[PDB]
Amino acid sequence: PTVTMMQVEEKPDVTYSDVGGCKEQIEKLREVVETPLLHPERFVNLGIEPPKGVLLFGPPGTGKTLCARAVANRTDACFIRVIGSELVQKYVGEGARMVRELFEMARTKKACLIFFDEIDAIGGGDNEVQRTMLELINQLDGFDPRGNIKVLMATNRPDTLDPALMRPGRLDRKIEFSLPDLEGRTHIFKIHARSMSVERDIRFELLARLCPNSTGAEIRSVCTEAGMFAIRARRKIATEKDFLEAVNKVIKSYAKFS
Amino acid sequence: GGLDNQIQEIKESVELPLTHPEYYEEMGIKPPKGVILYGPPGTGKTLLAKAVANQTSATFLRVVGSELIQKYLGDGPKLVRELFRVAEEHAPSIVFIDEIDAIGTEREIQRTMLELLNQLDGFDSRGDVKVIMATNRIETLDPALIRPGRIDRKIEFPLPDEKTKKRIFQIHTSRTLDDLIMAKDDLSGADIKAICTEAGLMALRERRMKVTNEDFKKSKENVLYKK
Amino acid sequence: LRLALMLNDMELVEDIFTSCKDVVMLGRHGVFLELSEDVEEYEDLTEIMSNVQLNSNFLALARELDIMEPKVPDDIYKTHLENNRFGGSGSQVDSARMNLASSFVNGFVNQDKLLTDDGNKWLYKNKDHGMLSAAASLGMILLWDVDGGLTQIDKYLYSSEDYIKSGALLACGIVNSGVRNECDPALALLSDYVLHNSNTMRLGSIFGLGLAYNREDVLTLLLPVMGDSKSSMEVAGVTALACGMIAVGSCNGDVTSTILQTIMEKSETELKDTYARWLPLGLGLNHLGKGEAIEAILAALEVVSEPFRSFANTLVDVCAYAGSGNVLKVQQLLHICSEHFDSKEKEEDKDKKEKKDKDKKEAPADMGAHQGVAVLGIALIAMGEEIGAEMALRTFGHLLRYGEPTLRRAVPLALALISVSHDADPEVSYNSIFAARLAAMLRQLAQYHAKKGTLTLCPYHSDRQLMSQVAVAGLLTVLVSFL
């Protein structure tokens, strides 16, 4: 369908210079996505084989921002993403043809990187799902395509028990996705300066130090819900005094139950 | 009647595109989401009267309910993609969806409505057309439709049942209130416009506008017995 | 007063002036009193009333002073137009033709007068035709303040350039219609007969004097003009249009030696058929006002010749059918509609907008369903300038998208004349179609001016011949049909 030609991840986004407080994890999952392609000879010459990937799970929070970092900071050619919602569809059995055509396009792209999104939509009879994941681990364990290929499993619920017991073979680094900090959000706002026309009267420090418990999704609702709440009245200028109720309401009315 | 603030607020809401071009192209708002409405009374004429302001100077498109999907095999979102491509070739238009009651009349509705949710957000298309969704009960929608779908603004239309009926009924008697503010359970603009239009034409028929309580309960009994 | 609009009699306006004067608003009925009256009954009215009038007050009203003395101050006071149209539409002009569209921006007025006096060199950088148009624009912006119009247009009088002073005399003809004090300085020098500045001053002065105006002295002065027969088309253009607009509303027309002279001299030399196209303008304008004239049969007897004067004859048939119960002309219209000649269809079928101009329910027909581009032009011209119902714009939906520059250029004019949020949206559609030079100049024209009276029904049949050189564009911008 349209997801085949639309599967390419064009239109780069959040870069590395605007990371959301990630200090150690950004290296733990960066040294496998950015450095192995920059220095392939060190991994093949120094030891057994280059690392494959890491594991990301837990609360959503600032999810998909680090994958946006991988898309933006790509050196030569942006990689291809894979979502889980394209597998569970009508006329079951198409998952084998889909994984064979994305493996065919992956080998057409000299064995580039593959990003798996929402593995819990198909994980958790699932014999065709076992065919997809066992064809993934089976066709990817072979050194024939490449050794620098990287997978990335992102999920919200750890209820995928079968992938959790099949992952220790190839995958590793079972760690939480990312914890949010307090000082890094001003860079998410600095890259949100390329968003819609925020009036220059707003100060990023005043909007930054007046909102605790401001995880990446919640500040995404600060800029997103702030802008759209400024489109409620279809206004033209967006001053912080106009949507301050949207700010303290989007942090407090949402911080009531959570 | 009486809902002037909500109709001027939704008027300024739906009158940003195609009007006032000196700031719409210089500021750069261009929201590719539209608004989402609903109403416990519904009846299509209240929400159609709230979104009817787009029909002044524009091209209107109306798709009421998913009945054309459930009456066929599992084709799914292909017709939605046909409306997306014809809406891309017909950008100066308004996508109006009304009476979303697929469950008020099951697993497929969640996946074709999830695909309609993802494709409706505009992941592969920038600001091209406005999408307006409308239903009757907000509790019938799945919680997945909250973050992607409802991002701009939702309206909270109250059902007084004892204030708007007294206002409109007072407008009718201006030319025995508990019987019609208690007996009636749904009103809209097509009722006052209907019985006032045929009341004016009837006043052209018999050349007098005198309204008696028995003739008004007979004309009410016509609509009550009609349904 | 409508009975005086249809009767065109002086006893009705005299009896309504003594019966409307005996019982005393005033400036309003003066406004549509001068608008409702034609050329004949305001000159007979101004001669019997200029004879006595018994109070001279309706003499003060029935001039070009009290129809405009309430308008200009009210148009400046009660209206407030922004400057982003003069600045923007006056800023995206280039290629020496969008700047001509900006000369239309300056020309069309109806408050702000910034683009008028935006420095100098705006008329020097422009071409000769743009020197005439921009020279008459200062006359089109000043249809008031005779004392100010004289001291504003006087700078361009007798200047070093010919088109500056000729367009300045045209400006003097546009600014006023009852002063007639600028005639002599231009009228005296007209006798040159070969090639002189007074030929273009004859264009602007005979045309402007025709806009200012059974007058015999100006026609005896126009006798050497019609007898000159200069190669310039606009000489006999503004001459035939001038005497024609002077002779509108005559009592059952006339067969005098004026139109007999221009018909004999028309048949004298059958060269430059544009003369044979714009002489029927003045002919049919002289035919206007008849009720029982047999002049159509007279022209059907004498004028019948090769299809040139047969096109003149069918133009006399166009102006001869202003409207009555004559369904014989409807079945005759359907009969002769299939003629092989590809111009008498355009004009004889173009008469639809004048014949049935009142009953607009029958005007929508199957003209759009044909295959000839000329027939689509017949429908597009048949749209007109009415209130612009949704059926008209429905016809502009299919008629708007066309490939020929004559119809793509002709569609925004009727699109913006029939509708005076549907103003800028069709213009955005033109921006989606185009984004040549003519379509750009005309689409900017519509960008600026988008926001049975003979004065409003006369000056577009000359606009029906726009598919020619830019020489006509010098006279196309000074039309009087703009209210």
Curated annotation (Swiss-Prot), chain A:
Biological processes per GO annotation: osteoblast differentiation; positive regulation of proteasomal protein catabolic process; proteasome-mediated ubiquitin-dependent protein catabolic process; ubiquitin-dependent protein catabolic process
Superkingdom as given in the UniProt entry: Eukaryota
Cell location: Cytoplasm
Induction data: Expression is not cell cycle-dependent and occurs throughout the cell cycle.
GO molecular function: ATP binding; ATP hydrolysis activity; proteasome-activating activity
Record's keyword terms, sorted: Acetylation, ATP-binding, Cytoplasm, Nucleotide-binding, Phosphoprotein, Proteasome, Ubl conjugation
Post-translational events: Monoubiquitinated by RNF181. Phosphorylated. Dephosphorylated by UBLCP1 which impairs PSMC2 ATPase activity and disrupts 26S proteasome assembly.
Record PTM N6-acetyllysine, positions in chain: 256
A cellular-component GO term for this protein: proteasome regulatory particle, base subcomplex
Residues annotated for ATP binding in this entry: 58-65
Disulphide linkage map: none
Subunit structure: Component of the 19S proteasome regulatory particle complex. The 26S proteasome consists of a 20S core particle (CP) and two 19S regulatory subunits (RP). The regulatory particle is made of a lid composed of 9 subunits, a base containing 6 ATPases including PSMC2 and few additional components. Interacts with NDC80/HEC; this interaction is detected only during M phase. Interacts and SQSTM1. Interacts with PAAF1. Directly interacts with TRIM5. (Microbial infection) Interacts with HIV-1 Tat.
Family: Belongs to the AAA ATPase family.
Protein name per Swiss-Prot or TrEMBL: 26S proteasome regulatory subunit 7
Species annotation: Homo sapiens
Gene name as annotated: PSMC2
Curated annotation (Swiss-Prot), chain B:
Numbered residues of crosslink Glycyl lysine isopeptide (Lys-Gly) (interchain with G-Cter in ubiquitin): 50
Any single GO CC term annotated in Swiss-Prot or TrEMBL for this entry: nucleoplasm
Binding site for ATP: 39-46
Cellular compartment(s): Cytoplasm; Nucleus; Membrane
Membrane topology designation: Lipid-anchor
Keyword list, A-Z: Acetylation, ATP-binding, Cytoplasm, Deafness, Intellectual disability, Isopeptide bond, Lipoprotein, Membrane, Myristate, Nucleotide-binding, Nucleus, Phosphoprotein, Proteasome, Ubl conjugation
GO molecular function per UniProt: ATP binding; ATP hydrolysis activity; proteasome-activating activity; RNA binding
GO biological process, one term: proteasome-mediated ubiquitin-dependent protein catabolic process
Domain of life: Eukaryota
Residues modified to N6-acetyllysine: 71
Similarity comment: family membership: Belongs to the AAA ATPase family.
Protein's job: Component of the 26S proteasome, a multiprotein complex involved in the ATP-dependent degradation of ubiquitinated proteins. This complex plays a key role in the maintenance of protein homeostasis by removing misfolded or damaged proteins, which could impair cellular functions, and by removing proteins whose functions are no longer required. Therefore, the proteasome participates in numerous cellular processes, including cell cycle progression, apoptosis, or DNA damage repair.
Subunit structure: Component of the 19S proteasome regulatory particle complex. The 26S proteasome consists of a 20S core particle (CP) and two 19S regulatory subunits (RP). The regulatory particle is made of a lid composed of 9 subunits, a base containing 6 ATPases including PSMC1 and few additional components. Interacts with SCA7. Interacts with NGLY1. Interacts with PAAF1.
Disease with which this protein is associated in UniProt: Birk-Aharoni syndrome: An autosomal recessive disorder characterized by failure to thrive, severe developmental delay, intellectual disability, spastic tetraplegia with central hypotonia, chorea, hearing loss, micropenis and undescended testes, as well as mild elevation of liver enzymes.
The name this protein goes by in its record: 26S proteasome regulatory subunit 4
Gene: PSMC1
Swiss-Prot record, chain C:
Protein function: Component of the 26S proteasome, a multiprotein complex involved in the ATP-dependent degradation of ubiquitinated proteins. This complex plays a key role in the maintenance of protein homeostasis by removing misfolded or damaged proteins, which could impair cellular functions, and by removing proteins whose functions are no longer required. Therefore, the proteasome participates in numerous cellular processes, including cell cycle progression, apoptosis, or DNA damage repair. Binds to the intracellular domain of tumor necrosis factor type 1 receptor. The binding domain of TRAP1 and TRAP2 resides outside the death domain of TNFR1.
Organism: Homo sapiens
GO CC term, one of those recorded: proteasome accessory complex
Known tissue expression: Found in skeletal muscle, liver, heart, brain, kidney, pancreas, lung and placenta.
Residue positions, PTM N6-acetyllysine: 272
Ranges for region Disordered: 344-366
Family: Belongs to the proteasome subunit S2 family.
A GO molecular function held by the record: enzyme regulator activity
Record key words, sorted: Acetylation, Phosphoprotein, Proteasome, Repeat
Name the UniProt record assigns to this protein: 26S proteasome non-ATPase regulatory subunit 2
The keyword ATP-binding is assigned to this record: no
Basic and acidic residues: bias regions: 344-364
PC repeat residue numbers: 133-166, 167-203, 204-235, 238-272, 281-310, 439-451
SUBUNIT field: Component of the 19S proteasome regulatory particle complex. The 26S proteasome consists of a 20S core particle (CP) and two 19S regulatory subunits (RP). The regulatory particle is made of a lid composed of 9 subunits, a base containing 6 ATPases and few additional components including PSMD2. Interacts with RPGRIP1L. Interacts with CRY1 in a KDM8-dependent manner.
Residues bearing PTM Phosphoserine: 89, 91
GO BP, sorted A to Z: proteasome-mediated ubiquitin-dependent protein catabolic process; regulation of protein catabolic process
